Design a protein around this nucleic acid. Structure first.
Length: 1078
RNA sequence: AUUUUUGUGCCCAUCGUUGGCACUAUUAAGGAAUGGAAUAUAG
DNA sequence: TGCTATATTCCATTCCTTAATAGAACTAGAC
DNA sequence: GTCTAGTTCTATGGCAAGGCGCTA
């Protein structure tokens, strides 16, 4: 029901005097230095846990007792860390020696887990526990007693309480509530309710609870039974009855009884520690005197990875077990026959070192079609040996063999256009053994080998200490606050300064490390974004109300661009170039205050202060909870479709619609509202450039840059192509260079492709690497049109940074290639050319920031659109595509490289977070299957309706590639891709509609095909033919779903020619649409 | 408690007219891929 | 018109997932 | 009277394809 996230604001610390920053420095170093003591100590505690302690415990999520013991007795940690190493073969033996019993299957899978043998090892935490006992001189009896209470207090085990809590109950010396009194009270309430099981009013319940505590009021009840702490839910009933807010609430007595009965265990004992005094004295010797807030904040940072890895490794072991059980070990014998390939004459290789076989080695299941073809050739060669061939069968057999070989080579080449190329020799070998293993067992055997290697490599998570950070705030932490805006105003008035300024002060209680006592101290921060959105005061009387969503942002309805006074403008203009952007925002903010345009922000004690000290830098973060209540009564669905090269798209669908444009969709009345592209327009003068699609200036305007490129490449003309049986053909790069140097080609295309040419050049002049240095600098770093200075967020721009990366890589690789002492490292590269190494790093950092910006700007458009729709219609459900498992070893690495820049996941995760801050927005991801081929609002209403995608182009620009593609669609050969059939319908409808036959496309000269199309189009007075093409820009939709669609007669039916992606966004919106209103 | 010069970043043949924008921080591991040099193979 | 293919080693990278942190409500006692 | 510094709180579809571009 309730929803929570945080919004953080980064800030810059504005230091005070050396000596005051030294004091905070010292405190932060004290907390950091103490944290590993708590880590080591809790790891010792875990190692003491045992059957007796965990007996009859919840044990949730199907984790067995062995697993729970194992995860606490044994952990994979860095080799050089303090606990003692243990060998993997020993784990079961030690477990039995500590348990009394052999480890079950869960603990068994834990111990078999893969890990990096050179970084980490298993560690024996039980030995760590023994060392606690010996060093602190605790009895096993005493420690075990404390350990058991700690277990029931959730200080250890699988579901820990908060550090603040654990610290308090273990270490605090405040007055405790008497637990026996609460046991008596809880037991009595149970009794009285068992004696009256059929009450139905809270009134009745309240009176029974009071009777149980022998009291007239809530106040007396609390004082006697639950003096200190948050109010237990059973006393809450009474409180709320006196307040009169729970009168017409239901009473479910069996629950009440059950809940009370559950809490009883924790009140059977008083929490009288036997060992805590010694453990505190040890702690005081290492981290200094006990204080709740400091010990708590140190413990926080130690517990996080200890409990985190327990949760994660437990889940991981369980998954491993499921995954081993999906492995069909009954297929091992088939594996071995396939794996026999390596012992065969078809693969023989020096050192005879073999590798793991995978489905893509035989081309997935397509081997079945290859076997069908090979078997047809064989059967037909058999009768050709009986009747056709008589005595001279020495030439017919040789013919069979060549035909077998050819059918295979053809198969691998076919497969290898859209995937990794299957291994000729492995398929030759496998066909030699047709009699030993059936084709569906070749697949199952290969699958067995691949899946078994995959599951058995999965790595356990090692337990690594945290780099800590410490939290200050209002409640249950180290004490701190942001000076409230009103207190800011008061403070400045008292010191006789300006009402307002641009800095943010915190007051935090900190330990003076010299006195080891607490002192409150003020520190200064700066963050313009915090100023704008939160802190800067609306002082003007009668300001606009605080906004529904709290922060003062454009997305929340505050443009924050007021008309500046003359002096304000001149402050901007006179500010140093490095400070002008910040001052402009300050000015715009200050104007908005003066002109009563700045809305209120409702201050609370809602911001946590997080401090991370790295060297002498302090990183201070301010973060606040943002609360939301879901609103499932949706009025609009906003589909979103993610693309790589083209633009992302959205589509809005009104649900429960009425009036004009309504469509009946399986009894639900719906209406298309709109569809669109996601663009991020940035204005330079009167022009505007779409960050997401701009591919750079035409080379028209770049001739000096390109001439300067040309001038260089001429000096390194020479290359020599692949030795195709010792040919050594000449290679001029200028033929390639001139292909890209047109006035119509874009800067980013030119730069990218030039990187690839320079790369190749370098490979042909490996001893002359150093000479490319300066022109690499010019291209990437220094030039006015270099990669670092000009680049959009377009796909091509990201491919630019990638190829630049690769070029630098080529450079270093050839520069440091030995004439022919270990491999070349980043240490080595940086020393050989710091500037170039630094350039690799600046390219890396520039790319990350571009990626981050993209995610943020795309997400903003989606959320802005959704908010806009919410304001007109009511609640919006945003639906994106569930994208996973994109990059696979079975695909060509060029395909994987192309898919890597997709960012659908990163964009979607950002929408997720942003949505959590707005009433009336929800985000789900849906199955994207057939999303690009469905006829929206016709598909599933009621018939399945799928159609191909279409390219549109003039006859001049038809390529061989297009003609070939259209012919592949008219091919009779079946496929297991269900979309194939759509393209085949498309190609058939293509012929009919332009009055062609297969014979007019098939075989005839490309040029003649262009002519044939030209004659047909000209007679029809059309500029452009549509043809079916995978990935095509256009879709022939029934409804007009692209505001700019034109109509067409296609095979005697009328469709709108829509952008294929605007169509996809509506389909994404429609996926299981009926479920979002059931 | 006063620093008054900065929260992080994004775009451009014109880097400014107030140029135009956007944004949850951190810690750690794991998962799947990618680039470069070279080796071994079959083409 | 051509973007050779598989597999491995070593040095490097990016995109994403999943374990965590960024406590609430309270009161006795100190101002 | 406000606030600090301590305590205790917590609640009852099987697969596998599909979803992604080239420039020129």
């Amino acid at each position: 029901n309730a929803s929570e996230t945080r919004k953080a604001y980064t800030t810059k610390m504005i230091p005070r005097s050396h000596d005051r920053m030294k004091l905070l420095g010292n405190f932060m170093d004290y907390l950091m230095d103490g944290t590993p003591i708590f880590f080591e100590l809790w790891n010792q505690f875990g190692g003491g846990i045992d059957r007796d302690i965990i007996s009859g415990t919840a044990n949730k999520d199907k984790i067995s007792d062995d697993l729970l013991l194992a995860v606490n007795w044994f952990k994979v940690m860095p080799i050089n860390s303090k606990p003692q190493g243990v060998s993997p073969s020993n784990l079961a033996n030690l477990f039995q020696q500590y348990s009394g019993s052999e480890p079950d299957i869960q603990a068994q899978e834990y111990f078999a887990s893969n890990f990096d043998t050179e970084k980490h090892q298993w560690k024996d935490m039980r030995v760590e526990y023994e060392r606690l006992l010996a060093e602190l001189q605790l009895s096993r009896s005493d420690m075990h007693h404390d350990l058991k209470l700690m277990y029931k207090e959730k200080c250890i085990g699988l579901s820990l309480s908060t550090a603040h809590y654990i610290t308090s109950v273990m270490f605090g010396t405040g007055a405790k509530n008497n637990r026996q009194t609460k046991h008596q009270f809880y037991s009595k309430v149970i009794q009285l309710l068992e004696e009256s099981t059929q009450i139905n009013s809270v009134e009745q319940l309240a009176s029974i609870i009071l009777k149980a505590g022998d009291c007239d009021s809530y106040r007396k009840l609390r004082i006697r039974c639950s003096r200190k702490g948050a109010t237990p839910s059973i006393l809450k009933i009474v409180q709320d009855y006196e307040l009169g807010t729970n009168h017409d609430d239901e009473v479910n007595v069996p629950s009440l009884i059950a809940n009370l009965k559950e809490k009883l265990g924790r009140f059977e004992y008083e929490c009288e520690w036997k060992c805590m005094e010694k453990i505190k004295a040890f702690l005081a010797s290492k981290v200094g005197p006990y204080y709740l807030g400091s010990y708590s904040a140190m413990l926080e940072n130690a517990l996080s990875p200890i409990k985190g890895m327990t949760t994660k490794n437990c889940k991981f072991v369980l998954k491993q077990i499921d995954a081993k059980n999906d492995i069909k070990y009954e297929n091992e014998p088939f594996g071995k026959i396939v794996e026999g390939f390596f012992d065969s004459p078809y693969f023989e290789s020096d050192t005879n070192v073999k590798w793991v076989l995978h489905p893509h080695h035989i081309g997935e299941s397509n081997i079945k079609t290859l076997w069908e073809d090979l078997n047809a050739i064989h059967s037909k060669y058999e009768e050709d040996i009986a009747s056709l061939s008589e005595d001279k069968k020495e030439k017919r057999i040789k013919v069979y063999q060549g035909d077998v070989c050819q059918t295979i080579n053809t198969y691998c080449e076919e497969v290898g256009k859209e995937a990794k190329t299957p291994l000729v020799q492995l398929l030759r070998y496998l066909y030699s053994r047709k009699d030993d293993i059936a084709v569906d067992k070749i697949i199952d055997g290969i699958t067995f080998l691949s899946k078994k290697h995959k599951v058995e490599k999965q790595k356990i998570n090692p337990v690594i200490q945290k780099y800590p950070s410490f939290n200050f705030g209002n409640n249950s932490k180290l004490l701190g606050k942001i000076i409230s805006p009103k207190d800011k105003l008061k403070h400045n008035l008292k010191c006789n300064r300006n009402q307002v300024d641009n800095y943010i002060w915190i007051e935090i209680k900190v330990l003076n490390t010299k006195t080891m006592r607490w002192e409150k101290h003020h520190y200064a921060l700066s963050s313009t974004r915090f100023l704008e959105e939160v802190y800067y005061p609306a002082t003007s009387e009668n300001p606009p109300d605080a906004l529904a969503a709290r922060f003062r942002t454009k997305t929340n309805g505050y443009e924050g661009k007021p008309a500046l006074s003359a002096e304000q403008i001149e402050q901007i203009r006179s500010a140093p170039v490095g400070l002008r952007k910040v001052k402009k925002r300050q000015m715009r903010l200050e104007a908005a205050r003066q002109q009563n345009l700045l809305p209120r922000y409702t201050w609370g004690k809602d911001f946590n202060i997080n401090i991370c000290k790295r060297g002498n830098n302090f990183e201070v973060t301010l973060a606040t909870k943002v609360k939301k209540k879901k609103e499932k009564n949706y009025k609009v669905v906003l589909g979103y479709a993610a693309n790589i090269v083209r633009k992302n798209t959205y589509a809005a669908i009104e649900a429960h619609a009425n009036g004009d444009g309504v469509i009946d969709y399986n009894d639900l009345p719906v209406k298309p509202i709109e569809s669109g592209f996601v663009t991020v327009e940035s204005q330079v003068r009167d022009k505007s450039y779409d960050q997401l699609s701009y591919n750079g200036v035409k080379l028209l305007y770049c001739k000096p840059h390109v001439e300067s490129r040309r001038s260089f490449l001429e000096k390194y003309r020479n290359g020599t192509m692949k030795d195709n049986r010792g040919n050594n053909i000449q290679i001029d790069f200028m033929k390639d260079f001139e292909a890209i140097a047109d006035d119509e080609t874009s800067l980013y295309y030119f730069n990218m492709k030039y990187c690839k040419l320079l790369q190749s050049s370098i490979r042909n002049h490996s001893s002359q690497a150093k000479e490319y240095r300066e022109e690499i600098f010019e291209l990437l770093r220094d030039g006015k049109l270099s990669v670092l200075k000009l680049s959009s967020l377009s796909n091509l721009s990201f491919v630019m940074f990638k190829v630049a990366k690769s070029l630098i890589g080529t450079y270093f690789g050839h520069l440091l290639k030995k004439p022919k002492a270990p491999p070349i490292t980043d240490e080595d590269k940086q020393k050989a050319d710091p500037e170039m190494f630094a350039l690799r790093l600046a390219l890396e950092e520039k790319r990350l920031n571009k990626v981050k910006s993209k995610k943020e700007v795309i997400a903003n458009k989606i959320v802005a659109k959704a908010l806009e729709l919410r304001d007109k219609y009511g609640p919006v459900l945003i639906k994106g595509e569930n994208i996973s498992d994109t990059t696979k070893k079975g695909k060509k690495s060029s395909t994987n490289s192309f898919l890597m820049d997709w960012l659908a996941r990163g964009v979607a995760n950002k929408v997720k977070e942003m949505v959590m801050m707005h009433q009336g927005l929800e985000f789900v991801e849906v199955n994207p299957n057939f999303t690009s081929h469905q006829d929206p609002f016709v598909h599933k209403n009621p018939e399945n309706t799928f159609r191909a995608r279409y390219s549109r182009c003039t006859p001049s620009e038809l390529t061989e590639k297009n003609r070939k593609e259209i012919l592949s669609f008219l091919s009779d050969k079946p496929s297991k891709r269900p979309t194939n059939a759509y393209y085949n319908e498309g190609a058939m409808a293509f012929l009919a509609t332009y009055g062609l036959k297969k014979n007019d496309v098939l075989g005839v000269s490309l040029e003649k095909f262009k002519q044939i199309m030209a004659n047909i189009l000209h007679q029809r007075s059309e500029d452009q033919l549509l043809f079916p093409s995978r990935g095509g820009m256009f879709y022939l939709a029934t409804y007009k779903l692209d505001a700019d669609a034109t109509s067409v007669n296609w095979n005697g039916k009328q469709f709108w020619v829509c952008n294929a992606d605007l169509v996809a966004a509506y389909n994404v919106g429609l996926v299981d649409i009926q479920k979002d209103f059931k």
